[PDB]
Design a protein around this nucleic acid. Structure first.
Lengths: 93, 104, 80, 96, 93, 104, 80, 96
DNA sequence: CAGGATGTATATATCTGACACGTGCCTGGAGACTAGGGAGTAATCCCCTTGGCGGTTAAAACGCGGGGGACAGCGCGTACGTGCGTTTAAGCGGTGCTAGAGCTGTCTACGACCAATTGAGCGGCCTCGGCACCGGGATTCTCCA
DNA sequence: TGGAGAATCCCGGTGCCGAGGCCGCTCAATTGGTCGTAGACAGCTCTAGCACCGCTTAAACGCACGTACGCGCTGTCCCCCGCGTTTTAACCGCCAAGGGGATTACTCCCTAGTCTCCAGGCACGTGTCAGATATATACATCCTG
């Protein structure tokens, strides 16, 4: 069965940030599991947030508030900035 | 047919993340902008961790990232340490820290 | 299987302490560490066996152990 | 014969083991101990090798953290030798 | 708005176990919120268990395994016994 | 129309608990036996906590259970204190405990 | 509002210590306690204000505080 | 005049305050402090009374637990007087 | 022991505001019932987990001096408890005020969803290249002196 | 400092198996309509949060003082570290069985979905009562004495 993973995109980000640095498959798996864990955390936070306000839909606002609840400090601020920039780019074209 | 990730300028799979959001049954409806925002946040976190790990590998004077470098990067950064305080990284070792009173 | 707690020898405890930054070790530290290790392993294995029994399996997989560790707030990477 | 002062080899081992990522407990004794513990919950169980490896990794990490806290407690008491009271205090504060 | 709570059933259980002992409204609120918290914990544990096995149904087995995961020791054993007894009584009658 | 609660011999509202299980959208479908099992577990836990709280109230020579007695009941039993270790009870006070070395 | 951390006076901290079983108290304990209290309140209030802002409200509800405390593993009953 | 030996009134206060469930911090100063802290996150906020009450209850419970751990750390160091190093050690072990 | 205060309990009225109890009604439960989907079950196979075994090495065991750290005892001075007026700011009840949570229509954007369609991604092979390791040299620590 | 004595580092070959690429191929992401839906958006309304004020008192608070606890010191001894020598058990390679868990059909049954009753549970009206609460009143209790 096809096991879907973020390896290609993690490699793309690495080559975008470190052009000449490679990565071992062990670190690949560690990074993939870290991404999965963060995804799960943010998704459950957004779902609980929706349940609290009785909203049946998950919007970018729920994701933003879950980011602010889960990520700490300057990390959360920068993540919110990139998320807002990407959403603006998406809905602008 | 341009991909949503390319439209939003993100490396991460906006479409795959949207599918993951729907399949997880987190909510009965999922907004259009939620996968893009989530993909951007994931890309930012991955870029930060990979940057710190690459820097740690460079200080180690190796050209490849290994779990030891990831552990060092995690334990060097403050907010990443707060986010990953309770996590254990396979083959990560420990931060070299010897208390003052133990020194001769 | 019987008395395999004594398989955690004194050199193993001493190496674990050295990795943790310990300089001197008392005599009863080894027995105390064996007791606490037994407690931790009992908790984790209980949760893992519960997860295995729920899935109607008889083989404890690595994913069951990962879930059991995650339930105690000790998430472990590299075994996903 | 040449003899190093007591403690010198202790910091040498401290510096050596904090630099490595290898496993410090032997694999077979830990596997036997895990099987013996699991025998009390459900009989005739089989273990994947990755499951035992994950258990060993988690146990070693937990013990390393516990010994770090024990060293902090022992240093607090104006001592260098860690003692069972230090481990007991560390576990009590952690809520275990 | 009608706010649902377990006050009547908690009072009934109290009168079943302590016939002559009363209870204050603060204790009612505390007990009700304790029941809500335990219910929530068991529900999320069952949902995670269902997601792990890709089962879209929550059966009594999921509740039993969530009980064993959440409640500790002899408390969990007693809870499992009472749950099995109640399920058997419901099914056979 | 006999109620499900009385059918299973439970005081707790099997019907209400079934409705709550459906409303939370924990899964697409819920079994017929899941609300009964969950109601039984909830009733058992409530009975245990109320039993210990009533005993604590009786030892205090009061008829009426108050949050102070519930806090005493929670911290007297090992199992519930393990389950409720990280919980603070409103107006619960603390267990009276003075260390041996502090005594004159 | 300015300098309200000094509103946690010495007798209040002494009473909090007495409730905790403390027999003697040092001089700098009061300042250390004020610092740690400020840290804890900052964390909890940050989470509560985030919850309030998400709901598009301008009044911090008690349920927001309960959720914020729950997110830190400090479940509080009696305000549900 | 009659003077009790030091520690007698301390033990009396310990026995008294562990028996009561009242709040030990004055309500108005804590309310003002909470408002000042919340002013940094979002301006012009209003607080429900039950919210401030819950904050005070949680803060007092947390401080009581912290002082219990501090007393344990002080007893570990063969002392009865608690010191800032004890609070720092307790917080470090708790992971704060 | 022992007397003299000293809070600390130890009874005792007493009243009051905090709760068990009516009340009505409507919004949950119970029943009926059906179609489709999930789950149990029955087979089935191959791969993974166990068990054995033998050689053989490096780690664990096993004494064992020796040094260094725990640790009990010991002065000592200071900082913390403890009385003691004093003042001040929290409490508290009442009152005005206002702003914004909550609720209610309403409709228009906005998302599910499915049937083609197609493009990217995942598994199964090639391949070569960073890196681990391993002797020897260089360096560096570290005890002794 | 300085020399031995061992420890750490480091470089050079040398081997090497694991990343990086690549290739069929399949699935999943994109598109394209299409229509319930839901959530924002005004509008409103009442209520709770705020603002304030008088006043009083009891808690904070500054200070003087007495005391007992931290704490460094001072031997002192014992028991943990370092270090050889056995010895043994972990390890590792491998192979044969075996069994068990996914997996694939496959049938059937059970739960949603809905609708029609129907019923019990839930916010105000009663009424009343155990519990706080001063108030004397013993009861330990503890520092002197």
């Amino acid at each position: 069965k096809n096991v879907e993973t973020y390896k290609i995109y993690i490699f793309k980000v690495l080559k975008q940030v470190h052009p000449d640095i490679g990565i071992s498959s062990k670190a690949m798996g560690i990074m993939n599991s870290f991404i999965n864990d963060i995804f799960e955390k943010l998704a459950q936070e957004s779902s609980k947030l929706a349940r609290y306000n009785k909203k049946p839909t998950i919007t970018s606002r729920e994701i933003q508030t879950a980011v602010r609840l889960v990520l700490p400090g300057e990390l959360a601020k920068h993540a919110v900035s990139e998320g807002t920039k990407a959403v603006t780019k998406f809905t602008s074209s | 047919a341009t991909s949503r990730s390319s439209k939003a300028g993100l490396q991460f799979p906006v479409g795959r993340i949207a599918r993951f959001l729907k399949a997880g049954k987190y909510a009965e409806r999922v907004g259009a902008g939620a996968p893009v925002y989530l993909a951007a946040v994931l890309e930012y976190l991955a870029a930060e961790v990979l940057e710190l790990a690459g820097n740690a590998a460079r200080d180690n004077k190796k050209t490849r990232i290994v779990p030891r470098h990831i552990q060092l990067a995690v334990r060097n950064d403050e907010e990443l340490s707060k986010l990953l305080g309770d996590v254990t990284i396979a083959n990560g070792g420990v931060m070299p820290n010897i208390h003052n009173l133990l020194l001769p | 299987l019987r008395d395999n707690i004594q398989g955690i020898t004194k050199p193993a405890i001493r190496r674990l302490a050295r990795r943790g930054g310990v300089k001197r070790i008392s005599g009863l530290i080894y027995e105390e560490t064996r007791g606490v290790l037994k407690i931790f392993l009992e908790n984790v294995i209980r949760d893992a066996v519960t997860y295995t029994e729920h899935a109607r399996r008889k083989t404890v997989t690595a994913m069951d152990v990962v879930y059991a560790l995650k339930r105690q707030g000790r998430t472990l990477y590299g075994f996903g | 014969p040449h003899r190093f002062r007591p403690g010198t080899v202790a910091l040498r081992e401290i510096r050596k083991y904090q630099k490595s990522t290898e496993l410090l407990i032997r694999k077979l004794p830990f596997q036997r101990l895990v099987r013996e513990i699991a025998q009390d919950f459900k009989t005739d169980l089989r273990f994947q090798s990755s499951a035992v490896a994950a258990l060993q990794e988690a146990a070693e990490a937990y013990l390393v953290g516990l010994f770090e806290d024990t060293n902090l407690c022992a240093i607090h008491a104006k001592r260098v030798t860690i003692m069972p009271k230090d481990i007991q205090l560390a576990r009590r504060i952690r809520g275990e």
